[PDB]
Design a protein around this ligand. Sequence first.
Ligand SMILES: Cn1cc(-c2ccc3occ(-c4cccc(C5CCC5)c4)c3n2)cn1
Length: 338
Amino acid sequence: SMHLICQSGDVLSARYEIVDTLGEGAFGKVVECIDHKAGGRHVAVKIVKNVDRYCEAARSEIQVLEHLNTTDPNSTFRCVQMLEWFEHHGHICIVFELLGLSTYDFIKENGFLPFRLDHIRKMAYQICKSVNFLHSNKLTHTDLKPENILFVQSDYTEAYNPKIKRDERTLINPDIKVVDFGSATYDDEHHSTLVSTRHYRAPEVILALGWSQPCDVWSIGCILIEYYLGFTVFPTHDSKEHLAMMERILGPLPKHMIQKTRKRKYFHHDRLDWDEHSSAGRYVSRACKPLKEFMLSQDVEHERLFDLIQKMLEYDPAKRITLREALKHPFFDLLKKS
Ligand SMILES: Cn1cc(-c2ccc3occ(-c4cccc(C5CCC5)c4)c3n2)cn1
């Protein structure tokens, strides 16, 4: 029924007039509205599908953001500001400060070109700071990805780039915020070993070994390579294929993780049950290669980023870098200058 209530001109809750759709997802829709009771200020309204799983996720997000916005009222740690919620013809709607495009959408609109490295450095720093603030308050996000990082302002300048024979957009201000707190889980809540639709998903989640804060660090590792390359390094929707891709980029999985997993289907003896010479197997060999071979330059700033990424993509969550540590990494020295 959503198409009947999310059109340009519709009014929600006797105050918000829909201008246009900003984007869609599995959850529903985000629309830009005029708030007729706050002087015409533009806001963003998430309209949530009338489906039990998303309604429960939306109620959860509301609890989480209430706690985070009162703990950090000035958005020092860059979590999105929720302004209120209401119900409209059986759909939960949540009102946010209006931001710019998602980082995914910016890449897409720019023809799948990567961000340049000085912007990557700022964005990475801000993402690590924001999610470490979550990790300090006994939370894990669990669903970090480029669609869920948004530019405060997505405005750009435009010129012809003769090095790659095409026009190129250059961001003016790379400041970001983190969104989507519907899967966010407290340390003391139930940690469901089941997880749903994502491929920023850590190896401990795939193998059902239990998870906590480190799973976020793995996701951030994936985001940073994507910003550097302009495309995903794990393009797959099959778990076993995903594990095969990991092995090609990062080497074989630790033996103690293979012995512990209850998911025996993926393994024969203590090896991944993967035919290298199948149709899908040859696609993996051709798309994926060892991590450092993705580097586009041997310059030391590039090597610094890739050392950070590698520590984030440690298989064993007990050994993986924490965000506290990552904020001190040399890659970020260039921001602290004086
Ligand atoms: C899942 N979620 C998003 C928000 C959110 C909050 C405020 C926002 O101000 C603008 C957007 C926006 C702009 C362009 C594209 C999109 C995309 C549609 C999903 C991301 C959003 C936006 N999204 C809160 N939860």
